[PDB]
């Protein structure tokens, strides 16, 4: 039986090979053994054992019933791995940490926390005689009759949803109880019993009972429901909230404007109008969410994101699995701190500047110590936890930490080791750099040879940027020689540009270094030729990807690549100290920004924020004294904003009334940024442009459950090759009333046969992150689902696939598990 696999497993006696055999022996009915071995990137060394163990495991599971199918997996679960540190109980944060002075008698008053827990309170007293430890005191908080209600996170109006909960009885003897539901106006209880009577039940001693209720929502997001438990000991009240959302897919449309009456920065802008547009597929009985924010500076939005909100809100909506997202947490805080410190703008605060400076420094340290989880043994940074080290993310995090070292000191040895690893271990003979992992950071235009050449050029220039940023920590000779070699590579093999993105990144990477070489001037002129300009004199000026797209086509829609190239050109112009050419670019970038201050993706966001901050810091800012008033087109007016340098971080006001919006200004200096976001709900995707072939359905198995199978594939454009896509993300919304089985995803992620890089379950969404989605065939995720409670008329959920670094290339489809016909408030008006 299990001895056959154990022979190989305990005979190879290799740390890496043992795990390969272990996850080769895992059950997998959907794909064959060779297909599983195809994805392994560790090399043949354990590919042989993986194939052998998979074959043996498949053979041994033929004649055995459902008794040894668990014995084998539970015997294989041990002695192959050592352990995984994991606790299943959660303990609340301790209280009463104060330090007092006792003059032989003191009394404090407080309240115990709401938790059925045996609190142990202890005290240590120190004085001139010495130290004494007082006797511990035990105080247990215990409620003998309890009611715990299981409330689903979100529901969609139009469903018959039953919510089920538990009545717990800790009394010794038997007891009969009454349970009561309070009905809110916007929810039909399907009986309208409102007292609403009762159905008395009975529970035994030290037992529990299960009680279910059936309801249906009418309004949206009704967070006020009461449950009453009335027993021999009286009546207890329990308050619960329910979040109801409409049908469709959330869609956000953003629009910005920059206002400057004096026209110092190129143009005069006193009035801007955003129309109240109602799209075709607006969900009935759903108001369109509109929010307006006004800030008194270009970096005013970043200041609002960092300072106005105590916690650092994430600028984007991307998943946090990758190390890049965890690193993104520090960038806005750093740029705010850099602007404040270098501009010496500590006088904006009314409180003590030193305390806020120390708090911001501690937040920087927080981010700095949060990124540390991804360091490997050789001080090289891995993209995912336990994955292979990548030079791309190593250079990126090296640049960011070299920035952070300006205000918060870094470990010199760590940066030295990382910077000497990325130079010695991975670098060509001619000066180029090789990637180690398969973390594709960008999909590049052209055919396969052109794709490889542009990938090499982009990676080399990116690494040069990082090294030139983090040189100050560890200035050495070998790394300087490698940097010079890479600079020579860029200089000699950049000019025959294939894509303007690589040309722009190479130009920026060269600008930080030697700017006297004539080839750099030729590169700069070639970049300057490709500029697209709107307005005469130039008011908008930007770049894009120009291989065969040199026809004048401005869709006016910002894309991650477009913003990235524009930001790199902006940084090159700033570093060359050219101000007359730069005003339209900063105007466009300031108009491009979103609510929180973060652009479409991460790598464009960091570069754009750096460009705006450096432009504000270099071009000296003007005194802020300005009057801005926003009013609806036909409806009444709205709050009027009078901003000085003492007040520009005003609270963001949501647009309540429905009308076209007009923002007007008087005579005043400075710059103002006005950004309007529009969150709306849609019922279809036919209008959108899809770029991924998708198909998701539900199957049934044989204890038997339901299974969900989704499949996605890439559709390359005419310019792109057929190698696939870059790092991609698949999002599956789940229908209300069911949950996703975590064991299947843990199997699909935590093995050497990883079909995906990371998985997570947040807010009723299953999010998976993968290195590449093939274009030739379909790649499919498959997992069981569990029915949490019975629901009826359930609304369909969504299935989205999008590239990580350019979310524009996305495709969404509506799907549902099953829909079969089922009088109690069923018709929702």
């Amino acid at each position, epitope marked *: 039986l299990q001895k056959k696999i154990e022979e190989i497993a305990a005979k190879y006696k290799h740390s890496v090979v043992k795990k390969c055999c272990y996850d080769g022996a895992c059950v997998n009915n959907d794909e064959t053994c060779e297909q599983r071995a195809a994805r392994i990137s560790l090399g043949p060394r354990c590919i042989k054992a993986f194939t052998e163990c998979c074959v043996v495991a498949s053979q041994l599971r033929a004649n055995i019933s459902h008794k040894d199918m668990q014995l084998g997996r539970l015997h294989m679960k041990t002695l192959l791995p050592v352990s995984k540190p994991e606790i299943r109980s959660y303990f609340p944060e301790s209280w009463l940490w104060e330090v007092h002075l006792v003059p032989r008698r003191k009394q404090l008053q407080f309240a115990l926390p709401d938790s059925l827990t045996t609190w142990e309170i202890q005290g240590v007293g120190i004085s001139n005689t010495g130290i004494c430890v007082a006797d511990t005191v035990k105080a247990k908080v215990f409620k003998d009759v309890f009611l715990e209600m299981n409330i689903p996170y979100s529901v969609v109006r139009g469903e018959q949803i039953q919510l089920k909960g538990t009545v717990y009885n800790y009394r010794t003897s038997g007891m009969q109880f009454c349970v009561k539901m309070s009905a809110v106006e916007g929810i039909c209880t399907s009986e309208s019993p409102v007292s609403s009577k009762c159905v008395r039940q009975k529970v035994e001693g030290s037992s529990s009972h299960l009680v279910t209720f059936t309801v249906l929502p009418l309004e949206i997001g009704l967070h006020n429901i009461n449950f009453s438990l009335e027993t021999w000991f009286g009546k207890e009240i329990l308050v619960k909230t329910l979040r109801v959302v409409p049908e469709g897919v959330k869609r956000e449309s953003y629009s910005g404007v920059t206002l400057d009456p004096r026209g110092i920065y190129g143009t005069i802008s006193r009035r801007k109008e955003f129309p109240y547009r109602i799209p075709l597929d607006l969900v009935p009985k759903t108001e369109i969410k509109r929010i307006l924010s006004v800030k008194g500076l270009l970096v005013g939005e970043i200041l609002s994101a960092v300072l106005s909100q105590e916690g650092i809100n994430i600028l984007t909506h991307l998943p946090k699995g990758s190390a890049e997202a965890e690193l993104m947490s520090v960038v806005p805080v750093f740029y705010v701190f850099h602007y404040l410190e*270098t501009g010496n703008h500590w006088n904006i605060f009314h409180s003590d500047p030193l305390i806020e400076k120390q708090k911001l420094k501690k937040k920087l340290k927080e981010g700095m110590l949060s990124i540390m989880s991804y360091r490997n043994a050789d001080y090289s940074y891995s993209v995912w936890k336990g994955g292979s080290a990548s030079t791309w993310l190593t250079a990126f995090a090296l640049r960011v930490l070299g920035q952070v*070292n300006k205000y918060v000191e870094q470990n*010199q040895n760590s940066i030295c080791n990382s910077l000497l690893w990325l130079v010695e271990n991975y670098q060509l003979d001619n000066g180029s750099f090789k990637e180690n992992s398969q973390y594709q950071p960008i999909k590049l235009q052209g055919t396969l040879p052109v794709e490889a050449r542009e990938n090499s050029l982009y990676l080399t220039a990116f690494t040069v940027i990082g090294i030139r940023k983090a040189f100050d920590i560890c*200035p050495l000779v070998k790394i300087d020689t490698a940097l010079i070699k890479a600079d020579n590579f860029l200089l000699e093999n950049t000019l025959p540009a294939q894509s303007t993105f690589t040309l722009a990144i190479s130009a920026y990477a060269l600008s930080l270094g*030697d700017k006297t070489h004539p080839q750099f001037r030729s590169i700069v002129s070639a970049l300057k030729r490709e500029a697209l300009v709107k307005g005469n004199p130039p008011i908008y000026r930007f770049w894009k990807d120009n291989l065969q797209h040199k026809d004048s086509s401005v869709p006016n829609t910002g894309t991650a690549r477009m913003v990235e190239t524009t930001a790199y050109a902006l940084l090159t112009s700033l570093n060359l100290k050219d101000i007359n050419y730069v005003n339209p670019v900063i105007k466009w970038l300031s108009e491009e920004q979103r609510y929180g201050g973060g652009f479409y993706s991460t790598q464009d966001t960091i570069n754009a924020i750096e460009g705006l901050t450096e432009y504000s810091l270099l071009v000296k800012q003007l005194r802020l004294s300005m009057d801005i008033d926003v009013s609806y087109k036909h409806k009444g007016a709205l709050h009027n904003y009078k901003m000085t340098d003492k007040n520009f971080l005003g609270r963001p006001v949501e647009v309540l009334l429905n009308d076209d919006l007009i923002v007007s200004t008087g005579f005043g200096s400075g710059l103002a940024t006005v950004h309007v976001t529009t969150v709306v709900h849609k019922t279809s995707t036919s209008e959108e442009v899809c770029s991924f072939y998708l198909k998701i359905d539900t199957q049934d198995i044989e204890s038997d459950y339901k299974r969900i199978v989704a499949c996605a594939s890439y559709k390359p454009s005419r310019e792109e090759s057929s190698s696939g896509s870059s790092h991609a993300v698949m999002d599956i919304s789940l229908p209300t009333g069911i949950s996703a089985n975590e064991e299947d995803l843990k199997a699909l992620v935590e093995g050497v046969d990883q079909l995906f890089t990371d998985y997570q379950i947040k807010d009723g969404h299953v999010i998976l992150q993968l290195n590449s989605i093939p274009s030739s065939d379909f790649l499919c995720v498959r997992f069981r689902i569990f029915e949490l409670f019975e629901v009826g008329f359930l609304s369909p959920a969504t299935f989205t696939v999008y590239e990580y670094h350019r979310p524009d290339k996305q495709c969404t489809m509506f799907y549902s598990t099953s829909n079969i016909k089922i009088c109690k408030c069923v018709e929702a008006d």
Partner: nanobody
Amino acid sequence: EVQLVESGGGLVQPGGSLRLSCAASGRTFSTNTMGWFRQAPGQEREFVALISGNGRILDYSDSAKGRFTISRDNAKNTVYLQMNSLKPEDTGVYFCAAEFRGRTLASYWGQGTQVTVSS
């Protein structure tokens, strides 16, 4: 206005002695690498030596092998270069630099001070 006004230097005999203390005149400079250049008349700035923001990393140009051994103090944000050995070929407005961003160029620059080796 972050400035690096120079201090130290003057007139000296072949085989004399001298010492400069590049003193900061603005925002703090604790962790930023600082070093020294050479400004031989007719030509322009040329690297001489550098020391990091911690002091554990040093670099000396081949010409000036370390006859002006470099140090720095963080309490006053000052950089000490002690030119004892001098000859009538070290003439030029010596330069101390801000955070380096590589080896040459550097970010912030000072006006320099004139040192003349009069025979």
